[PDB]
Amino acid sequence: PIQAQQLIELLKVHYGIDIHTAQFIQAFAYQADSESKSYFIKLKYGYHDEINLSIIRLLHDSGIKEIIFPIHTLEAKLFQQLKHFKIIAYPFIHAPNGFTQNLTGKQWKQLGKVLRQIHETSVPISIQQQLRKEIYSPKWREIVRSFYNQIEFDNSDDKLTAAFKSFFNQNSAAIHRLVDTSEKLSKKIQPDLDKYVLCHSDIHAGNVLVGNEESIYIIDWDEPMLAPKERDLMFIGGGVGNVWNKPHEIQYFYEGYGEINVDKTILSYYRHERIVEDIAVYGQDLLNQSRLESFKYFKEMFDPNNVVEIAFATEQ
């Protein structure tokens, strides 16, 4: 939570960079410009998810360009824990995401090609033991069920808490189905750890910086995992963010992927499941500044042509 001069010194110290500016972008981040090059920094409190930087190494090694690589510290490292802590510099990519920038059909093909490399990238048996495995935890559903009961009129509510409690009832049917379906389809999947692949676990329009020309980047590798490829492929046609829902695009994607057979059941299951999770996530939050957003997003999940519909509409 520091300010320019503070940060400006750390970079000059640990990275050797001579930046004159270090704005802040409302774990924190800033756009620290140099005399010639712009950077994107990440200050993260407490040492966490080191189980991320691995994959970036493994991927950069795999020679996948669509992965923004960190900048080296004088110590020749990718970060600057500085006594347990953590700093991460990245060059600055002036580019909007799929929530702003639409992918040209061509670019879609390229997203197909990189998701495939990633899905075909072998994982060091060692690194494989730190990544999480898809076990179909009935956790999430239990968190949403604990909500059926949690809706009662308690004056000690709030203008915002009421609304959610309301809207949730105003859509109880849909939800139970999402839960009950995410429950039934799990009961049709026979875990096959022999097919699990290195999946980016949340690859929606929000995590693809759609640059110019014909260069794109895939980001946020905080929670990569080993699972049925459909874990990622489900986002193609997903509708997350009220985008990536045009069927004519699902084609451009798989043309850069390859037609490797797709288990429509893991695809359906994962589609209801991610919702249940958000409902359980945005949910448990609305029961302090994100509560305003966690409800705006929560409600969009039910708007025309968004994840909830696409989940119930068998368009696979």
The DSSP result for 16-45, as a single string, is ---BS-------EEE--BBSS-BEEEEE-S
Q: Annotation-wise, does 220 bind a ligand?
A: yes
Taking CA atoms, 231 is separated from 94, 235, 262, in Å, by 29, 8, 11
Q: Is 101 in the site for ligand AMP (CB under 6 A)?
A: no
CA dihedral 49, 51, 57, 58 (to 10 degrees): -150
Q: Show the tokens assigned to 50.
A: 């080191």
Q: Annotation-wise, does 93 bind a ligand?
A: yes
Q: What is the closest distance, in whole angstroms, from the C-beta atom of residue 82 to ligand AMP in the complex?
A: 20
Count of CB atoms situated within 10 Å of the CB of 141: 21
Which one of residues 24, 28, 69, 92 is an interface residue with ligand AMP (CB under 6 A)? Answer: 92
- The phi-psi region of residue 21 (left if phi > 0; otherwise alpha if psi is between -120 and 50; otherwise beta) is beta
Output 123 or 209, the one with its CB closest to ligand AMP. Answer: 209
Q: Annotation-wise, does 40 bind a ligand?
A: yes
Question: In what helix (H) or strand (E) does residue 226 lie, and over which residues does it extend?
Answer: strand 225-227
> What ranges make up the beta strands (E) of 65-193?
87-91, 132-133
Which one of residues 220, 255, 263, 309 is an interface residue with ligand AMP (CB under 6 A)? Answer: 220
Q: Is 68 in the site for ligand AMP (CB under 6 A)?
A: yes
Output 97 or 268, the one with its CB closest to ligand AMP. Answer: 97
User: How many residues bind ligand AMP, per CB under 6 A?
Assistant: 8
Output 56 or 68, the one with its CB closest to ligand AMP. Answer: 68
| Stretch of residues binding ligand AMP (CB under 6 A), selected from 12-20, 85-93, 103-111, 172-180 | 85-93
Binding site per annotation, positions for Mg(2+): 207, 220
Binding site per annotation, positions for ADP: 40, 42, 91, 93, 97
What residues make contact with ligand AMP under the rule CB under 6 A? 40, 68, 90, 92-93, 97, 219-220
